[PDB]
């Protein structure tokens, strides 16, 4: 294991980017949110919609994101998008967790 060119193994650090999101429903708009992660060597991570997994390898029905972060861009918000985004990360040195909220209001 290594940092870049030095023998160190750094435990992961995931955090809920702003802790509480909000959105206006019935507008069919798109919205971004995140529980961003880091570690060395590179981490692995997943997160849930109050209990069921939003796993980036199989759950993608109206959402997508970038690497070196967790910025999950959700399309067409309608009313069903409300969530308690508990998020977990792990790497070759350790394990970590956080939680985001998302209050979706119907005008």
UniProtKB/Swiss-Prot annotation:
**Cysteine-cysteine disulfides:** 35-87
- Modified after translation how? Polysialylated by ST8SIA2 and ST8SIA4. Polysialylation modulates cell interactions by confering both attractive and repulsive properties that are highly regulated by ST8SIA2 and ST8SIA4. Polysialylation is formed on a-2,3-linked sialic acid of core glycans.
Provide the protein name. Neural cell adhesion molecule 1
Query: Where is the organism placed in the taxonomic lineage, from the top?
Result: Eukaryota, Metazoa, Chordata, Craniata, Vertebrata
Residues with an annotated glycan are 22
Where does it live in the cell? Cell membrane
Q: Which residues form the Ig-like C2-type domain?
A: 12-101
Function noted in UniProt? This protein is a cell adhesion molecule involved in neuron-neuron adhesion, neurite fasciculation, outgrowth of neurites, etc.
């Amino acid at each position: 294991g290594k940092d870049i060119q030095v023998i160190v193994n750094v435990p992961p650090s995931v955090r809920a980017r702003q802790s509480t999101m909000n959105a206006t429903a019935n507008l069919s708009q798109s919205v971004t949110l995140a529980c961003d992660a880091d570690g060395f060597p590179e981490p692995t991570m997943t997160w849930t919609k109050d209990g069921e997994p939003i796993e980036q390898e199989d759950n993608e029905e109206k959402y997508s994101f970038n690497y070196d972060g967790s910025e999950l861009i959700i399309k067409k918000v309608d009313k069903s998008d409300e969530a308690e985004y508990i998020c977990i990360a792990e790497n070759k040195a350790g394990e970590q967790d956080a939680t985001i909220h998302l209050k979706v209001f119907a005008k």
